[PDB]
Each structure stands twice: as structure tokens, then as C-alpha cells.
Design a protein around this ligand. Structure first.
Ligand SMILES: [Mg+2]
Ligand SMILES: [Mg+2]
Ligand SMILES: [Mg+2]
Ligand SMILES: [Mg+2]
Ligand SMILES: [Mg+2]
Ligand SMILES: [Mg+2]
Ligand SMILES: [Mg+2]
Ligand SMILES: [Mg+2]
Ligand SMILES: [Mg+2]
Ligand SMILES: [Mg+2]
Ligand SMILES: [Mg+2]
Ligand SMILES: [Mg+2]
Lengths: 85, 288, 250, 87, 109, 97, 133
């Protein structure tokens, strides 16, 4: 048999029920939106479109963040948004 | 008509009970049971193959494979970016006009050809449109206003002699897709986009009156046009004095996809209404 | 008053239409209440039992989804471990005790997953199938064009005995033009019957026509079918789906 | 017996709950709204003015179009130079 | 609401056929008979319907829906009604066919 | 090989029950219905299987793409393993190459 | 801040052009037959022959060619309503003076179809035109 709601949404609908419902709305709206963190270790290319050097064609290009690990001792200080690669 | 019907009075009801697939329709499958198809069951004996493990397709048994000893050469090189023009012979055009699929009375562009199913465009395959080829040149008697994306001297010559007009226009891939299947686009709920210009390689094509390019200087048209007569030895008619002339002169804006509609409008097909932007910025963008 | 029905669509020059009695359902005794022309390209089509077969089989199968599942030696409960050592124990060598050889073990091939049998016979073939079914129902005398469908009463016994008096056979398929417009006497009578079945035009199909011994078509129903089926001989291949705007087409 | 009522395609405009988490994110798009307009559009309850690019969207379309699609004059100029160098 | 007892469909043509059919030719078409009365065409639907319905109530026998495309002249209706139709089965045809003494058939249905 | 000694209760199937009498009724819904609904719509079944078909690998692969995140752990794991198996088998094994 | 718009019904006849027909148009009457592309319509009456050949939905004569195994060339005559055996007789009597021998044939009586060995497609369209089908 199947779960009616996808498990990825089990974290979210955990917050729509119980005591989390009674939390102040501004707080929940500060947690909801995850803004993309400023690039630190990887260096981003500005353009959305980039001409393929080999091909000579206009290519769509995206920026993919490099996963960085933050040891818990980084939570005691301020490391400048960076951490272990 | 069908004398078969008269044999059906005599015979029992057609029911679900007696129904035969046409003989030969089903070749019966065979299973590895019994003395014939059992005992090694068509798999041979031992080795790699009876066990089902023989190597991949190109593999030659360790000697350098045939498809890899041959050297690489650009053949299909950049194939995806080559332009593709679907050919339309004058023979097919004539045959379509004769049978009343496309009518020569109103102007003929890509949408008209597609709607008569005289031609099929698939932009996803990088079709840039129809090209006109001369196969039926001698036989061609029709009088038409035609717009294609490419044409041959001979084809043009064969259309002029009959008192029509050819013009080569360009459509970019998006434009093209919209052009060929307009009604699927009008359900899309988007404005009518600008027609893009041709890329730098194709500019010397559409700027020439030789090709009767849509970007060409009309001053050269009546000159070059007459030239085509001297070569093929026929009297060039005066298109001006004809009764259908107002239709024959009909162009598109180089920035327009259709006839009589304009970039930036919106077609609401349920209300049978058109919607146009009153905004200044929008009107500057769409009209540029 | 004689009810005479002329065809509403062009017949080919080389072919005359076909004719059938218009029967009325009100009296037991009124058998021929009128005269009708049916179109030769629908009811006179060359009988094709081969295509009938294709379409009946299609109707049967294309809907079908088998939920029959067996566990492979992978999905069975346990037996990740070699039940004894490869050599010296003196007996046959085995990996998992859930191997398809073993008693409780996994099934070697067997049915797998919910399976769909789904396919589409090309349009023109299903159309042709319908034409042929109609043709054959007619040629074998088992098709009856009825006017009306107004019934004198809601007693189903009336209907049974009516079918007995006209020798209609055991089962009867009553086709009506739309679902809401069905007369209430009919609906009452036919809701309590097993063999007599009332169905709207859009629910006409090959299977049901071969299941019931006798077909009864309303007059507007004929005028409907004739047009719907005939439409396909003259039509282009679809550019995009027909549910979208077309020039002439609804 | 008598058959069920025939299955029919409702031609009314269809709007899914924007607040129901079980709803697919493709049916919440602007694109879905526009399509819902082009299907009906009077009865849709879609603002027609919503079918055009915003000031932001328009400025970006503008910027992009001016970047990757040159002027006719700019291109003829571009070609004459190449032809010159080849000569 | 009563139900009339079913007809047996067993049909033999009567000797008066020609006269019945020509009388119906005259009264249905309302026409003084053109010299050949059996060769007149049934193409009109009023005339065909009235003619055949009258034949049906007179002769206690009707033309089946399949054969109604087959009747053009009146000659066709003549020829149709000349041929008898037995509603007895093959079995029932064998009971009455004068069987030898050494063959007994018993019906066990 | 011992065979059952008692005649089973003879099962009477009436073919005129509702489900059998109404079978295949709306199959022509597209043609006769001025095409709006394709016969696919009539198909009652698993979500990933409606109006679609394919060999066991394709089937599994599709099930995972559609409902794979609504699945129970054990069943998802089993599915992944089945997919991997079928992949290896179809691609690398057989007579015909 | 939705920009302003204007609703007019008057250009919609330009959209009406773009709708494709779902049915195939009956061919236009001409003043001269055969037409430039060589298409000739069927006759006003139909011949007396005990068979008939329907036109294609596109109004052409249903004679096609077919290959199999790359070397087997055939010609199919389709949509034959009538005594097909008649048509077989006439077709082999027509083709015989060409090959010196009777052409090999297959008659499908249920399909309403004739099938001939070799490519005779042109000459057969000509011959079926002459008989006015
Ligand atoms: Mg097998
Ligand atoms: Mg063997
Ligand atoms: Mg053995
Ligand atoms: Mg061995
Ligand atoms: Mg060996
Ligand atoms: Mg193509
Ligand atoms: Mg295991
Ligand atoms: Mg282990
Ligand atoms: Mg031992
Ligand atoms: Mg092992
Ligand atoms: Mg088990
Ligand atoms: Mg072939």
C-alpha cells in the first residue's frame, strides 16, 4: 500500500499540526523561505547564458552550490559562512 | 452491393461464440517443452552462449573492433545545428491547387501548406521551413502568391511566368513552431511573440532581390525579376494591371508572424475576441 | 400517418440505399408503422468478421490490468545465508534457502506486478468495426429500427411479451439518443430486466451488440450514428487532437 | 439493466486549492492560469492584463533580446568587415 | 392490455395471388394499370410502404428488413410471395418424412 | 496424483448479471462522443498504469518515478533491487545480443 | 499595476484563416480535363461492369506498389466492390499482351482486393481511368 502524502512533505505537515500551529506567523515565515546562501567556496559565473567554446552555440548555464560541512564547533564561533569542504 | 451479405441470411448469428482471427494473423509462439523444443532449448551447448553471457554488440572477441579501428571524421559533425528545409516541388503545389486543398486566391504561406497537409514541418528537428524545388516547372500552370523560406531560380522563374509572386521569408525556430500549428499556440494563453531576425550567416540570402528576399530592397525587385525573364525567355506579365493584384502585393512585416495580426496581441478564442496592449512600454517593445 | 425517412447524407453514385421497416413500440400489433432508408456505407458495408474479431478482442483486453504478483527469491523473507558449507557435508550445494528450488522459496518466473494490457486499435479500424456490426445485425434480420420508444406502461412483463410476440430472441439492446431524454416508462421497465438493456447512443459498441441477440435503434439514433461513422471516410488525419478548435469541426 | 450516465468532460474552469499541500506544483503555476484563460477566459476569472510580462519581466526580455540578437545594421556591418579581411 | 397469440409464420402461396396483387397495384398506386402491371417501379417510399403494408395485412406475411432493399419492381414482390417458408425444424421435418420401420427417433428435450 | 473424490458444487454463472451485461459499453466514447474523452479515461487501475503499457523493467522504472516517494521503505528498497536486477539482465544477458 | 488592454472583435476574421479543416474538400470543378497535375474526376454515370473501384479519400485511383524481402515487387488494386473475379479476368487479359504470359495474381475476396506480381502501377491507373472509375 501507499502513503497518501509523500514523505518529503512529512516534515512540513508536521509543522501544520500540534503546537507548531500556534507559533507566531512571522517566525514560521522566516523559517519557510530558504534563501540561497552567498557563494563562498565555489566561484559563480554571472551570466545565465554562455557560448559553448567547442560548439559555438548559445548554452543555458546554471550555478550549483558546493556542499560544505559545518562542524558543531563552528556554531560556537563565527566562521564567515564557510566550513569544511 | 456486397453479395457476401446474402450468404449471411443463411448462416447462424454472428456472436461472441464464433469469431476467428484472419488466418496468418497470429503466428503461434512456441515453448521449450517436449522433445523438439526442450533439452538445450535452442541455446546450444556449454560455452558462453548457452549460459547467456556472450559479450556486448560491437565486440569482436578481443581484436580491435571494426567500428573502433576506423578513424573519426566529421560526418555528422555539428548535425544538430544544420538548417533543414523541407522540400516542396511545384508538382505537389500544382496537385494541391488542382484538388482544392490550398486555394491560390488568397496568399499562400507556410500555415496554408500545413493546413492542406501538403507539407509537414517539425521544428524540433531543426526544420527552418519549406524550400521550393523545381520538379514540376514545365507543367506548372497556377497563378499564386507564395511565401517560402528558400527557393531555386528555376522555381521562381516558373512561378513568375504564370503571373504570380514569390518571396522568401525567414522564421526562427520558435516563430516557426507557432506559425505551423497556430491553434495549439492560441490555447497557450501567451501574447504573439516578435518574429526574430535571421542569423548572420543567412543575412546575405534574405537581403538579395535575387532570392526575392523579404528583407531585400524593393528597388531591385523589378530589375532582378525582369532579368529572370531574359534568361528563361518568356514575356514578364504586368502584375499591376491584374484584378487580384491587391492580394498579390500582400507582405508581412519582417517582425510579424501572421497576416493581419500583430506582435503582442492575444487571441481569446472562447469569446472570439482579440486583446491588444494599451501600455506604452509594451507597445514599444512589441513594435520594435 | 406514414413515417418515411430519407437519408441526410450523400450516397455514392454507384450505390442505392438500403431499407427497413420503422416499427413502433406502443402496440403489440403495430409492426410496420413506417419505412426508412439507411445509408449503404454504414449498414451495407462489406461484412468483415475479421475486423469484428479485432475490435471485440480489443474491447475485452485494452481495459485489463492483472494484479497478480509472485515473490522472486529476492522478496522472500529470509535466507541471506548459505545453509551449509560448499564442500564436505556430502549433500547438494545451495545458496539461500529461499531459492526457487526450495520448498518455501521464491518463484522462478511467475506473474510480476500489476500489469497493463493496453493498446489502441487505430480510429478508422474501430469505426469500421462498428459499421460492420451494424451491417451484420441488419443482414441477419436482427436489427429493428423503432420510432419513439414511448411505452404504454411501466410493467416490464409488457416488454417481455412484446419481444415474444415479434420473436425478438432472448436478449435485446435498446439504443436511445441521449441519457436524460429517455422516456420514463422505458427506464422503469428496463431497470428491472436482466436481458433487456437500455443504453444511450454514445454507449453503442461491438461487444454489447454481439452479446445481445437483437438490436433496437431509435430513429434519431440512426440519423446520429449514420453521420458520426460516415464522417471518417472523408476526413483528414488529425493535425492536433479533435477536442481542439477545427475549421468545420465541433 | 440501464447503463450509467456517460462520462463527460466538464467545460467549466477548474481551480485547485492553492493552500492544499497535496496539490501538484504544475497546477499552481502562472502558466496554468494563462492556459485556463485561453480555454475560457471570460468565465475563467483571470485578469486579462496578467497575460503580459511585468515591468521586471519586460526589462529582462528587453536586456536579453538586445544582448543576443543584434541589429540588422550591426550585422551587415559585421559581415562587410569579414568579407574585407578575406579579400 | 392483452397479448395476441403468436403467428406460426408457416406460409403457402394462395392460388388467387396474381389477382390480390394486381388489385393492390390498382388501389395503392391509384393508377389505371399501365399495360405491364408487374413491371412498375416501387422507388417512391409512400407507394412502397403502403403497397407492402397492405400486402402484409392481406397475405398474413411480411418482407424482412434485409429483403426490403431487394424489392424494386413489383415482379420482385411477386417472386418473393411465390416461395413458401416452413418454420418446422430439420428434426420436425424428419418426424413427418415417412421413416423406415427400423429407425426410431425419440425427442428427449 | 490422487484426484478429488467428490463432485464440486456446480458453479452457476449467470452471464446476465449487471457487470457482464453492461461490459464494454462506453469504449466508443471518443468516436461517438465528438472526441472529448479518450477511452483511456475509462481505465480503473493503479495510478502509474492507466492507459500505458511496457515490459517489466519499464513498468518498475515508471512506478518508481511516479509513486516512488509515497512507498513503504521495504517496498521501495525491493523495487530498487528489482530495477537493478532487470537492468543488468536485459542489457547484459540473453541469446540474441 | 496590470497594463491596460483593448478588446476588439474586428480582426478575428484573420484568426478564422488559421483554423485547419478536419474534412477533405471536394475537388473544384474545372473547365478543362485532365487538369495540369493530370487529375481526372470519375464519370457522371458509372460503367456497366460487374465491379466498381471506389476512389481514395483523396480522390485518386487506389493502385499502389508494394515490396517485400527487398526483391518482391507487387501492385495492389484496392477498394473493389463487386465480382472481383471479373476484375481479375480483365486485368490479366489487359496485362497479358504486355508480358507474353498471364500475370500471376492473388484475389482477396473478403478484403475486396487484387494483388499482382511486378510493378504495373502506371499502366493500371491509366487502364482504370479509361474505364471511368
Ligand atoms: Mg517466449
Ligand atoms: Mg532439442
Ligand atoms: Mg529429458
Ligand atoms: Mg549441459
Ligand atoms: Mg564449448
Ligand atoms: Mg520532415
Ligand atoms: Mg536477501
Ligand atoms: Mg553474506
Ligand atoms: Mg556422496
Ligand atoms: Mg550466492
Ligand atoms: Mg512462497
Ligand atoms: Mg509495405
Amino acid at each position: 500500500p501507499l502513503h497518501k502524502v509523500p514523505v518529503g512533505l512529512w516534515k512540513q505537515l508536521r509543522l501544520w499540526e500540534g503546537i507548531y500551529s500556534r507559533l507566531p506567523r512571522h517566525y514560521l515565515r522566516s523559517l519557510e523561505e530558504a534563501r540561497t546562501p552567498t557563494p563562498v567556496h565555489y566561484r559563480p559565473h554571472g551570466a545565465k547564458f554562455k557560448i559553448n567554446p567547442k560548439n559555438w552555440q548559445r548554452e543555458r548555464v546554471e550555478d550549483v552550490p558546493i556542499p560544505v560541512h559545518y562542524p558543531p564547533e563552528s556554531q560556537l564561533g563565527l566562521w564567515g559562512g564557510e566550513g569544511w569542504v | 452491393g456486397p453479395r457476401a451479405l446474402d450468404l449471411l441470411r443463411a448462416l447462424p448469428r454472428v456472436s461472441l461464440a464464433n469469431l476467428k482471427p484472419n488466418p496468418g494473423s497470429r503466428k503461434p509462439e512456441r515453448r521449450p517443452r517436449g522433445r523438439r523444443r526442450g533439452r538445450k532449448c535452442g541455446r546450444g551447448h556449454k560455452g558462453e552462449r548457452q549460459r547467456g553471457t556472450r559479450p556486448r554488440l560491437g565486440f569482436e572477441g578481443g581484436q580491435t573492433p571494426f567500428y573502433l579501428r576506423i578513424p573519426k571524421y566529421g560526418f555528422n559533425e555539428g548535425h544538430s545545428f544544420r538548417h533543414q528545409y523541407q522540400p516542396l516541388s511545384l508538382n505537389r503545389l500544382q496537385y494541391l491547387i488542382d484538388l482544392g486543398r490550398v486555394d491560390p486566391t488568397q496568399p499562400i504561406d507556410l500555415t496554408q501548406l500545413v493546413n492542406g497537409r501538403g507539407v509537414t514541418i517539425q521544428p524540433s528537428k531543426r526544420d527552418y521551413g519549406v524550400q521550393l524545388v523545381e520538379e514540376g516547372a514545365d507543367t506548372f500552370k497556377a497563378k499564386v502568391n507564395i511565401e517560402v523560406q528558400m527557393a531555386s531560380e528555376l522555381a521562381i522563374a516558373a512561378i513568375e511566368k504564370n503571373g504570380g509572386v514569390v518571396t522568401t521569408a525567414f522564421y526562427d525556430p520558435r516563430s516557426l513552431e507557432i506559425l505551423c500549428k497556430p491553434v495549439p499556440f492560441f490555447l497557450r494563453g501567451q501574447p504573439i511573440p516578435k518574429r526574430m531576425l535571421p542569423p548572420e550567416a543567412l543575412v546575405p540570402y534574405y537581403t538579395d532581390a535575387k532570392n526575392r528576399g523579404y528583407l531585400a530592397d524593393p528597388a531591385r525587385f523589378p530589375e532582378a525579376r525582369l532579368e529572370l525573364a531574359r534568361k528563361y525567355g518568356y514575356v514578364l506579365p504586368d502584375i499591376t494591371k491584374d484584378e487580384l493584384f491587391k492580394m498579390l502585393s500582400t507582405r508581412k512585416d519582417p517582425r510579424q508572424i501572421f497576416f493581419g495580426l500583430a506582435p503582442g496581441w492575444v487571441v481569446n478564442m472562447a469569446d472570439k475576441k482579440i486583446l491588444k496592449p494599451t501600455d506604452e512600454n509594451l507597445l514599444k517593445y512589441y513594435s520594435s | 400517418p406514414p413515417v418515411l425517412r430519407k437519408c441526410e447524407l450523400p450516397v455514392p453514385a454507384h450505390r442505392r440505399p438500403v431499407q427497413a421497416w420503422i416499427e413502433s413500440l406502443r402496440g403489440y400489433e403495430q409492426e410496420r408503422v413506417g419505412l426508412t432508408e439507411l445509408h449503404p456505407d454504414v449498414f451495407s458495408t462489406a461484412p468483415r468478421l475479421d475486423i469484428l474479431h479485432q475490435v471485440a478482442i480489443w474491447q475485452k483486453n485494452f481495459k485489463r490490468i492483472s494484479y497478480a504478483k509472485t515473490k522472486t527469491r529476492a522478496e522472500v523473507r529470509g535466507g541471506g545465508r548459505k545453509p551449509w558449507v560448499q564442500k564436505g557435508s556430502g549433500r547438494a550445494r545451495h545458496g539461500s534457502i529461499r531459492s526457487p528450488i526450495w520448498r518455501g522459496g521464491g518463484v522462478a518466473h511467475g506473474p510480476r506486478g500489476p500489469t497493463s494490457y493496453y493498446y489502441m486499435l487505430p480510429m478508422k479500424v474501430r469505426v469500421q468495426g462498428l459499421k460492420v456490426a451494424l451491417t451484420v445485425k441488419l443482414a441477419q434480420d436482427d436489427l429493428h429500427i423503432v420510432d419513439s420508444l414511448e411505452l404504454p406502461t411501466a410493467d416490464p412483463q409488457y416488454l417481455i411479451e412484446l419481444a415474444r410476440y415479434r420473436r425478438w430472441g432472448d436478449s435485446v439492446l435498446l439504443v436511445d439518443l441521449e441519457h436524460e431524454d429517455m422516456p420514463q416508462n422505458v427506464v422503469a421497465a428496463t431497470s428491472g430486466l436482466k436481458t433487456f438493456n437500455l443504453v444511450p447512443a454514445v454507449g453503442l459498441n461491438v461487444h454489447s451488440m454481439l452479446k445481445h441477440q437483437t438490436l433496437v435503434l431509435t430513429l434519431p439514433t440512426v440519423a446520429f450514428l449514420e453521420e458520426k461513422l460516415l464522417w471518417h471516410n472523408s476526413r483528414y488525419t488529425p493535425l492536433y487532437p479533435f477536442r481542439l478548435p477545427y475549421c468545420d469541426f465541433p | 439493466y440501464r447503463a450509467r450516465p456517460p462520462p463527460r468532460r466538464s467545460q467549466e474552469p477548474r481551480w485547485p486549492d492553492p493552500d492544499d499541500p497535496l496539490t501538484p506544483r504544475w497546477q499552481l503555476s502562472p502558466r496554468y492560469a494563462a492556459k485556463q484563460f485561453a480555454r475560457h477566459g471570460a468565465a475563467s476569472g483571470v485578469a486579462a492584463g496578467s497575460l503580459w510580462p511585468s515591468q521586471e519581466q519586460l526589462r529582462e526580455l528587453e536586456a536579453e533580446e538586445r544582448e543576443w540578437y543584434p541589429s540588422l545594421a550591426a550585422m551587415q556591418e559585421s559581415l562587410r568587415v569579414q568579407q574585407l579581411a578575406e579579400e | 392490455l392483452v397479448c395476441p397469440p403468436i403467428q406460426s409464420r408457416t406460409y403457402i402461396p394462395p392460388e388467387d395471388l396474381q389477382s390480390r396483387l394486381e388489385s393492390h397495384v390498382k388501389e395503392v398506386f391509384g393508377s389505371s394499370v399501365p399495360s405491364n402491371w408487374q413491371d412498375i417501379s416501387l422507388e417512391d417510399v409512400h407507394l412502397k410502404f403502403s403497397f407492402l403494408a397492405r400486402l402484409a395485412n392481406d397475405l398474413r406475411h411480411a418482407v424482412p428488413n434485409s429483403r426490403l432493399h431487394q424489392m424494386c419492381r413489383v415482379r420482385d414482390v411477386l417472386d418473393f410471395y411465390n416461395v413458401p417458408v416452413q418454420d418446422r425444424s430439420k428434426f420436425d421435418e424428419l418426424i413427418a418424412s415417412n421413416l423406415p420401420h427400423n429407425l426410431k427417433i425419440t425427442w428427449g428435450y | 496424483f490422487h484426484v478429488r473424490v467428490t463432485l464440486p458444487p456446480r458453479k452457476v454463472v449467470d452471464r446476465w448479471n449487471e457487470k457482464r451485461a453492461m461490459f464494454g459499453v462506453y469504449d466508443n466514447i471518443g468516436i461517438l462522443g465528438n472526441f472529448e474523452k479518450h477511452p483511456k479515461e475509462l481505465i480503473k487501475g493503479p495510478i502509474w498504469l492507466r492507459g500505458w503499457k511496457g515490459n517489466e523493467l519499464q513498468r518498475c522504472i515508471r512506478k518508481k518515478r511516479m509513486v516512488g516517494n509515497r512507498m513503504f521503505i521495504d517496498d521501495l528498497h525491493n523495487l530498487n533491487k528489482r530495477i537493478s536486477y532487470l537492468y543488468k539482465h536485459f542489457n547484459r544477458h540473453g541469446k540474441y545480443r | 499595476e496590470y497594463p491596460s488592454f483593448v478588446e476588439s472583435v474586428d480582426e478575428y476574421h484573420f484568426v478564422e484563416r488559421l483554423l485547419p479543416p478536419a474534412s477533405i474538400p471536394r475537388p473544384p470543378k474545372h473547365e478543362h480535363y485532365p487538369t495540369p497535375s493530370g487529375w481526372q474526376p470519375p464519370r457522371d454515370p458509372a460503367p456497366s461492369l460487374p465491379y466498381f473501384v471506389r476512389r481514395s479519400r483523396m480522390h485518386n485511383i487506389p493502385v499502389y506498389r508494394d515490396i517485400t524481402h527487398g526483391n518482391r515487387q507487387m501492385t495492389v488494386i484496392r477498394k473493389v466492390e463487386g465480382d472481383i473475379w471479373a476484375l481479375q479476368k480483365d486485368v490479366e487479359d489487359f496485362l497479358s499482351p504486355l508480358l507474353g504470359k498471364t500475370p500471376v495474381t492473388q484475389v482477396n475476396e473478403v478484403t475486396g482486393t487484387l494483388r499482382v506480381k511486378g510493378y504495373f502501377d502506371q499502366q493500371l491507373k491509366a487502364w482504370l481511368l479509361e474505364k471511368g472509375f
